[PDB]
Structure formats: C-alpha cells, structure tokens
Design a protein around this ligand. Structure first.
Ligand SMILES: NC(=O)c1ccc[n+]([C@@H]2O[C@H](COP(=O)([O-])OP(=O)(O)OC[C@H]3O[C@@H](n4cnc5c(N)ncnc54)[C@H](O)[C@@H]3O)[C@@H](O)[C@H]2O)c1
Ligand SMILES: NC(=O)c1ccc[n+]([C@@H]2O[C@H](COP(=O)([O-])OP(=O)(O)OC[C@H]3O[C@@H](n4cnc5c(N)ncnc54)[C@H](O)[C@@H]3O)[C@@H](O)[C@H]2O)c1
Lengths: 339, 335, 336, 340
C-alpha cells in the first residue's frame, strides 16, 4: 500500500537459494519468510554464514528453534521433501523461489500452488517450453504479473542472451555455436561414482577433470530472443574451478563487421545486467559480480577468409552470483507487477 | 586352489578390489552384486580418474560383464539372501556397500546358496574381529564367519604403531592424518546428509578438519595399545593419497636412526620403507598398506624428555584395497 | 607526520601490505621496486585471485601508477644497493622479495641515497629483532636498522604458545602446519632453484612435506620457549589459508575447557577465538595473525600423563600481512 | 650411422618433454639415449626422472653415478654445458639431438649442435622458424628427404589439431575455422599471482585456480604442416586447473554438406598410430599418458544446419605432455633413419 513488501519462500537453500537470500537483504520490496530444505536449521544457518566461494555473510546469523535469525529477524525453516506438503501460506508466502533442482517444470512447480501454499513460483532453472523464461534486461517486459509459474532461465542463458541479442540487433545472426567453459557444480560427483541421473561424465570427479557436457542454453534461446529461435546450438566443458564460467559464441552474421565494430556494439549495449571490459581478467575476477554477463573485448575475433566471416564473442559470468543477481532482479520486478 | 571372491558393492573399494584381484594369481572374482545400472558400473570400472585406465577390456553383456574375454556375473539384489554366491563358486564375500557392517547383517550372505565367510570393508562391531594383514592376521583361526578389514587409516597406522610398541613401548600418542578428500564430502558447500558441518563444505577447495576413529580403536588390532592413541584428520584437496603423522611418548629413549632402523626391520609386503623425499602423487596406486617415510622422523629431547614423530604414507584407496585382498585370500584359505 | 615507506618485491606480501597501508594514516608507500613493468604491477594490484578486486582506483602512468589519486614510482632494479630510495623520501623499506632475508643482505638498502631502516617480511636470522605484533613488539625501541616480522607460521603459533606458557607452563612440543602452497613451489614438476626436491613438485597437485623453522626459532619471539618447540609443514592444494597444530606437554594438568578458556582470555586484535567449525576458506582475508579454534582442542590423559593439542588458523597471506603492517606502523611511530 | 644400427639420441634440456622422451625411448626397439645435457644438478634431475606427479613413477631404477645416471643397468652420460658448440655429442655416438630447452628454437641456433664433434641432425621441440620444416608425424612426415639438418616437431596443440583438420580437408574441404583448446595449465603460468617474466598479464595469474584465456599459434601456423589450410584457421586457448590433459575444439565451414555420421566415419577411417578414435564419453584424466598425438571424440561432434548453411564442430583430446612426446619420439626415429 504505502510500503509493500512481498513475502517470498525459498525451496532449496542451496547455492542459488542461499545467494538469493543474501541479495534479497538489499531489496526493499521483498523479504524471505520461510525456507524449506531437507535438513535442520543449524546446517542451513552455518551454510548461510560461511561460504567457500562467496565469503562470510554480511551480518549476523543465529540459530533458533525451528529456524534462524538474520540480523535479528526470524526466518522459519522446514524440511518437507514434497512441495505439496509445504504450508507456505502459514508464513504469508506469495512467491516461491524453486531452487532445489528437482521441480523445474510447470507441472512440478505448481505443486507449490494450493490453498495452503503459495500463489506464484519462480523456477531457478530452465522450466520447459511452456513457461515464460526471463533474462532480466533482455526480455523481462514479457511479464504482465498474471503468470503463475515463470523461469529465470539458466546461468548460461543469462550470459549468452545479452551478447547474442546485441549481435542480432546490430548485425543480424545467421547461425552460431557456443561453448561454455564452466565451473563444476553440485550435480557432478566429488569422486568417480554413480551419477543419480545416469550421466557418465557427471559421474566423474568434477574437481579433477575437464568434463564435456550438454547444455540447452543455446538450443532454447528462442524462448528469450524469438528472432534467434533455432539459430544457436552449443555444449559445455566443466572444469576445476568451484565457481566462475565463460561463454564463447562463434557466429555467422548478416553483415560484414570488424573487431572494433563488434566491441563497440557490445559497449553500447552495456547496462546493469550486461557489463563491458577491456582488461585481461581471469575467472576469479568475476566471482561475486552483479552483472548477468560481462563481455570481454580482449577475446573478440573476426576472421575473414575469401570474403566470408566467422565472428567470435566471449562473455564471463559467475554462474552463482551473476545468475542470482539476474534472478533477484526478475523476482523484484515480478513481485512489483504481480496480480 | 583359486580363492573365488564375490564383491557386494561396486563403489571405489569394490571396483579397486576387482582391479587388484586381476593382478593376484590364485584369487579371482566370480560375481559382483550392486544395485547400479551395469552400464554405469562398466564405465566406472573402465575409466578411473585417480587409478588410471583399466588394464584390459570391459564390455557389458547380458547378465554381467565380459572382462578380458571372460564372463563375470553381475547381479542387482537388494537382499544378500537372494544372492546365490555358491552358484559361481564364491567362498568369501567382500562386503563393501556400507549397509551390512555388523555380524548379523553380514551373515545374511552366509546361507544355503551363499558364501562361507565375509570380510566387511568397515568397522564391524563387537563380535567381529578387526584384521590388518601382516599386523594381526594371526588372530584368525578360520572358524570366524564375519571379520572386518578395518579402515584405510587403521591399515596405515597399525604397522607403524606396532613397530614402536614392539621395539620401544608406547606410553601414549596423538595422530593427525592429512587425508585426501572422499566421496562423503560435498563437492560444493551444501547440506551434508550426515549432519557434519565440515563435510558440508567444498571438499576440493578447503582444508577441512574432521574426526577419525582409527587411533581410538587401535586396541582392536594391537591390544597392547588399547586406549593409548587418539587422533583427528585434516582433509585436503587431493583426490586420493594421504599421510599419517603420529606423535608419541615411548618407554625407552631413542634416536632418529634407531627409530628408522626399527621401521626398516619391520618392512614387509604390507609395510614399506623409504628414504626418498616423495610427495602424495608418488603413492597413488601402491600396494603397501602403509609406507614409512624416514625423511620425516623426529626425536625431540628437551630436559631429558622425548617426543617422537613418525610418519607413513598411504593411498587411502589402493593401499587399503591391497590389504583387503591379502586378508580375503588368507581368511578363505585357513578354512 | 607520515613516514614514507618503500616496498622491495611487489609480490603476494608486498601487494597485500600495500593494500593494507591504504588504510593506515601513519605511513604511505612512495616507491615500489620489482623486476617487471608498471603495467604488470598495476594489473596484479587491481586483480587478485584469492584476495579479491582492489578497493579503489588504479591507473598506469609513466614510471609508476596512480592509486586512489596518488602516484607511486615503480622501478626495476635487481640489486638492493642500486635502489635510490632516498630520491622518493623513503625512510623504511619492506624487504619482501624472498632473496634478501638476512641482516647483511637487507642492510644493502641502507645508504646515503637509500633508506634508513628495513623490515624483512620473513625470518631474517638470529641477529635481527624478530617481532610478532601483540606478542613481543615491546622489544622495539626505534633505533634498530633491520628487523624481521617473522613468518606467517610464527605469527600464528606465537600467541597460542605464549598463552599455554603463561597459563600452564610448556615443557616441550611439536608442531605441524598444514599450509597453502606458495610461489616458491613449482607449478608443475621441475627444477626448484633452491634445490628442494619437494618444492620441485607440482604444488597444487600434491601433499608436500617441508621443513619450517617457525617452532625452532620461537625463542626469538618468546624467550622462555627457546629450544622447547620443533615442527614441520605439509603443503597442500589450497592457494592461501593454513592451520597450525601444536602437541605439547605442560607443567600442570589441564582440561579442554581450561585450555579453551585461557585462549579466549588471551584474545585481542592479533589473536582471535572461535567455536564455529570453520574450514580454510573461511579465514581467507582475515586480519587476525592467528585464529584459535576451540573445536579442535584435545587433552589426552593416559595413565595420568597428558598430551595437549591446540590448533589455530591463519591466512598465511592476509594474517601475516596484517601483523606485518601493525609492526611497521608501530616501528615507524617510535622510529629514531 | 652407428655400426650396431641403434639410433643414438642426445637430449638437450631435461624438462617435462626431455624426461618423458627419455622414458618413452626405453620401450622403443633400436633407439637409445646416450647423452643428456642440462644445467641442473643431476641429483635434482634424477629425482624428477624417478618421480612424476602426472606421469607416474619411472619404470625401473635410476641411480646417480659419476658423470651421469645408471638407468635399468645402463649408463647414460649427463653433462651441463650452456653452449651447444661445447657438447661433444659425437663422443657418445649421438646422431640426432632432441633440442628441448626452448633456448635454441631456430635454424642457426639449433645448428650449433652440428659441429666437428657434435651431432648430425636436430629436432626442435617447438615451432622453429621457417627455414625449418615442421613435422607432425603421420600427417606430413613424408616432406622429409633426409638432407635436412634442423626440423621442428611443431607444438603439442598442432599435433592434436593437424590430423583432425587434415581429415576434414581430405574428405570435405575446409573453407575456414576457429579453434579453442581447453588446455591444462603449464610451467609457464605462475603458481600464484605474480609478475610473469614474458609479460603476459594472464599467465601471471594463479594457474591452478583460474580459467585463463590465452593466445595460441597452432591454428594460424597450420599451413606449415597442411599448406592448403594456410590462412584458413585461427584460434585461442582457455587454460584450466588440470595439471596435464587438454582438448581441442574446431568449428569450421566446409566445401560440402555433411552429417554427423559422415564426419565421424571420416575420422575413424583416418585413424592410425598417431590419430585415435573413440566413442566412449571420457574425460581429461582418461587421456593422461596416451601415445596417440590426437584422440578424436565422436561423442562431441556437431553438424548444425540453419537455412541450408552448416557449421561443423569436431573435438579431439590430447595429453599435451605424453601425446606430444610420443609424436616427437616417432619423428626422432624416422628422421634419424632416413638421414643415414
Ligand atoms: N549452481 C549454479 O551455477 C546454478 C546456476 C543457475 C541455476 N542453477 C540451478 O538452481 C537449482 C539449484 O542449483 P544449486 O547449484 O543451488 O544446487 P544445490 O545442490 O546447491 O541446492 C539444492 C538444494 O535443494 C535441497 N533439496 C534437494 N531436494 C529437495 C527437496 N525435495 N525439497 C527441499 N529441498 C531439497 C538440497 O538439500 C539443497 O540444499 C538447479 O535447478 C540449478 O540447475 C544452478
Ligand atoms: N604465505 C606467503 O606467501 C608468505 C607469508 C609470510 C612471509 N612470506 C615471505 O615474504 C617474502 C615474499 O613472499 P611472496 O609469497 O610474496 O613471494 P612472491 O614471489 O609473490 O613475491 C616476490 C616478489 O619479489 C620480486 N623479486 C624477486 N627478486 C627480486 C629482486 N632482486 N629485486 C626486486 N624484486 C624482486 C618478484 O618479482 C616478486 O614480485 C618471502 O620472504 C616469504 O618467505 C611469504
């Protein structure tokens, strides 16, 4: 009314859930009133306070009965394995951040939406072709607030999208192939063992190998940039850094370009979500950043052979914090326009 | 003559035991039981991040694997009562799932169609003898049904502690194992199912303190040392390969040279001796249960009192596996 | 008045000391010497794999760089005797190269066109006063020409050992530090210039035993413990962050609770206390020289005899540097 | 030209490549190393030969003796001369020198090994200039006629890329392409952030703690090995935290339409002792220590068709240490035998 604060719940207080909670501390229009995971409050409070890659929490965390206090404010913790059994409404939760990795579909996410549950769900991952998929500052205008389940896309999509959109808007994209050189994640095995999803490569020791893997980010780009539907494909190489990633795109364009023209087009597209740098940085320099995507002008190529051009553009992203920053921008916007 | 082994559980220990058994003449694996898709299991047997490519060929066939041109049965039974080990001539089972680590549970393999004996790859409880081969396998009389092969750290610590005890007498001591990360640590910070706030942390990106039971339970293997040793671990970012340091008080005054000589005199197939200044990668894949490193010995004398430091390397994977395979063969043969 | 400082060796310790000096009113850096160019040094100050992006502005200039609006000269002279520190008014040099850590080598900075005093960022031998801030900085009178800030491990071990000695009396002890790899280890197996067959090995892929003098030389810092402590190191694959374990015999019987309480009572800006079950990444960037961890304490009693184990964390980079800069600030203020 | 018909090899520089070449030669019929020259203390070198973090313990025994090593019961002289002109290679029967120091990677510098009491032929373990033929064994070793004095064995990445690019060219024709190698860290990167002597602001960074972009010369120089591809390929690298083992991705346009199945079949048909083929979904640790110069991975192939136009992606693994060493040792033996 005079000071609206929408109540949010987090399902899955993992890497994305905990970092989203950290960022929400500085968002006036939303607050987290309930966390659901599979463990006790002491474990969750400890993992919020201490973070290997993202540093100590900015404030105080104190375990209480049934939850924990953050800077004095109590947050309820439950441990319900089934979303239909989470009584989100008890804590006034209107929007659930679905961050477990197990309910990333329209049908699975709407298990949160019932009389004693929530009203809307933001999936912290691709959610299928039938949910609106949003990269903040690339296509968040597709939201009208009436949606029940939306997707924040993947980390790679949030990196690739502003870069591919800038190529499309300035030069026109014919086709392209992407490789993301990506930090290992919690879905890879720490040492060689049976991967629950049957992936023979994620079965391998993730901090000791270059591990090829599939990704849908390029194949599904049309959900975010319709004019690029079907034009991009890609894959990943997972490598031994615990967070921090980079996306390379090799494309053919509808117009001839120079390296200088490509770089200038990216700089002109820079905003809170898409950064620009000319410094020769490495992955540790992007851990914790707030851009969804950080274009690196030092890696651009335009190769001309017999009058034909291949164009290579490269952008950094902290698959943790870059994605989380985008997710929280989208949540904040969605909450404000919600209906 | 050949000892025919069945392996229940095809994780790290089961797979490496299978690999090691291929190089030990007169021991063979004739059945594997594990709940995982055999296509995943075959791939994990073929390719190993730390232990290298499989020495030979592995193909999935209906009913099991073809390994080096020979069929090996692979089943997926949840209940040991339903594994007809005896069909494949299995006399002894390596119980390496973690789910049957007691006398009563492991004896489920001993049935009308089952095995005769079981070795658990974990502490086994009060009615289960704990054996470190070449330190106390003489305790076996062959009438046992279920025994334990102890833990990887116990197999490293035991011959070193036994040599100190036999030569000089141990009063007390504290152990620290600087230990590779393992599968029970999280790859990245996240809720640990066992409730351990330190195993919850990214295991390949941190020095992680943790508890260990090897020193406090050493009396099961060396009864003279009951209650005399305590210990802890620091888990660090190598994917296999570990080192145990022991600081002890002794009943006799000693010199560094006398300590090193006692260790060399105790060397055997299970307890190696080196004077080369090696590092952890140099012990990946070794078949000693413990490799004493004379370059790290200290004897500190202050005001007539001595603290003694002895250090042994172990591949927490292959050193322990090699010890289990020695114990499997010996236990099966005593009948 | 503000004392002008020079840094020889703009390495891990040199750059982090520079970063901390930005927040110290009593000293300022007016000259850096290394073996490279300003572009390289400015880039390495800006971007730091383990300690994060620089807090402020950095711009390359001719002959140096501008940090937070202030130019600092950068030179490339490999021999200390040839560094004209006096041209930039430098009075005290931080000797942080790793190559000049003795009184005779460090005093080459002190001459008519050089500096007046040197702080070696490392053990510097038995003939230089060796200071762990908040354990023995009172030994300084300001007239010294060369002093040592000791090692990272000494700064971790000293307040912990001193608390045991003050409360209970130490008979003897052995220390192991489980320590991050450093720039002196090889990235991949190859000839180590110092001849160390273990530092020759790939440092981010091995547990690497190594000698350390931190315990054996504790008597330079805590004279009553001279000769009572010895130790060694295991270098392991983290790029910074370390932990020191000490196993000791004491002059009186203790409990775990009494040991932990004595450490808590000794806590100050240099010696922290925690009861949280932390891991090494949690101490990267801290400003304590030593962070005692009560969760790791043991007191083992067997047949009436006790072995006591106490454990303290340290960021071998930022913990040491925070101590070094406290010592430099104090030394500069009392300097004669 | 030894009476006993054994190819006698000298190694200048006992770094990673020199030590692994020595190791490989122990199992090569009719080839032996009879002299090693390196400035380092032989006790350090012997220890590094015995114990190897990524390539395992030496197969046999190594002992220091006066003037050299005894390796598996055989003496090998080890000297420490700074100048090739002062290495009397001929005294140890050495016909061919593996020049692996990085300090003599040109025709006139490497020819300092060829003198009155020196060697007859030199193989440089690096790009070597352009009065120096560049040889990837089993791709273009047919360019040697035996009259050459100094040749180059190219680089590790070139030995990976060459058979893969050659198979595309021979079967389909290459218009242009871009390569990225996701590559193990190497000894020229810093273990922790610090000044890089070569001036590379990215190699200055902690190599086992970062994804590190870097330039590479293999694609731009491919014309030295495959002349018809001169000017057609460019590339770059991402160095990542594994201590050995690398992978090369190539995205190319071709002169005719292809399918994934046709591309993979063409690679399988091109397989030989230097270029392997796999359909197993392996990871980098699985290729450590292999003897192929390049191992094509059919699981990673893409052929993307959009509005009738195709981009083709092909990927090959290599142990940037042992794959390259294996190729160098093949080239050493072959060059020595045609030189006679
Ligand atoms: N880590 C990244 O880089 C990244 C980036 C973008 C998107 N994502 C996506 O975010 C989601 C989570 O990824 P993450 O890396 O944070 O994983 P994570 O493993 O760190 O977190 C998952 C959390 O969910 C909990 N959980 C599992 N099942 C649950 C259940 N039935 N009910 C309640 N809690 C449950 C787990 O205990 C854990 O804390 C995935 O969909 C992932 O694809 C990850
Ligand atoms: N954990 C640590 O890294 C740590 C902690 C405490 C003390 N120290 C000690 O600090 C000192 C530096 O260690 P570091 O880790 O920062 O090493 P470093 O390699 O990061 O830095 C050394 C710097 O000195 C430069 N240099 C080398 N020789 C030089 C010369 N003749 N003249 C001018 N510059 C030269 C180098 O280019 C480099 O920038 C050593 O004495 C070390 O023992 C290190």
């Amino acid at each position: 009314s005079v000071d609206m604060v929408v109540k949010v719940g987090i399902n899955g207080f993992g890497r994305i859930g905990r970092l989203a909670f950290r960022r929400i501390q500085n968002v006036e229009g939303v607050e987290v009133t309930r966390i659901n995971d599979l463990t006790d409050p002491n474990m969750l409070a400890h993992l919020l306070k201490y973070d290997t890659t993202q540093g100590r929490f900015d404030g105080t965390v104190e375990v209480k009965e049934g939850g924990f206090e953050v800077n004095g404010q109590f947050v309820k913790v439950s441990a319900e394995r089934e979303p239909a059994n989470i009584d989100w409404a008890t804590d006034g939760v209107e929007i659930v951040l679905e961050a477990t990795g197990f309910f990333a579909s329209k049908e699975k996410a709407e298990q949160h939406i019932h009389e004693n549950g929530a009203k809307k769900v933001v999936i912290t991952a691709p959610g299928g072709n039938d949910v609106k998929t949003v990269v903040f500052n690339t296509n968040h205008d597709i939201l009208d607030g009436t949606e029940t389940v939306i997707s924040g896309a993947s980390c790679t999509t949030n990196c690739l999208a502003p870069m591919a959109k800038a190529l499309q808007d300035n030069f026109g994209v014919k086709q392209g192939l992407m490789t993301t050189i990506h930090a290992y994640t919690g879905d890879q095995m720490i040492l060689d063992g049976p991967h629950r999803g049957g992936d023979l490569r994620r079965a391998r020791a993730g901090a000791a190998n270059i591990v090829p893997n599939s990704t849908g980010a390029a194949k599904a780009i049309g959900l975010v940039i319709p004019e690029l539907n079907g034009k991009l494909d890609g894959a990943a190489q997972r490598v031994p850094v615990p967070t921090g990633s980079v996306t390379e795109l090799v494309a053919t364009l509808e117009k001839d370009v120079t390296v200088e023209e490509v770089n200038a087009a990216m700089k002109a597209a820079a905003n809170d979500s898409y950064g620009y740098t000319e410094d020769p940085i490495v992955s540790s320099d992007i851990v914790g950043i707030s851009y969804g995507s950080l274009f690196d002008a030092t890696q651009t190529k335009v190769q001309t052979v017999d009058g034909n051009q291949l164009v290579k553009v490269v952008s950094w992203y902290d698959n943790e914090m870059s994605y989380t920053s985008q997710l929280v921008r989208t949540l904040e916007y969605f909450a404000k326009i919600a209906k």
